[PDB]
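Example 3.2
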Amino acid sequence: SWMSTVGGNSGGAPCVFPFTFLGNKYESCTSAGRSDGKMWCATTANYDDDRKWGFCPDQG
């Protein structure tokens, strides 16, 4: 990916795909756990454990 994160709380850590959130494997960004609109990505292989996340990069 070579992409740092925004949002979240990683501080600019690359999204690790596929990342599993709340039971599902995410190969792309997600809006899971969010009821706003900003999509994010986990910065760890298994989010359920590490729970380290960050918003999705350029979605262009």
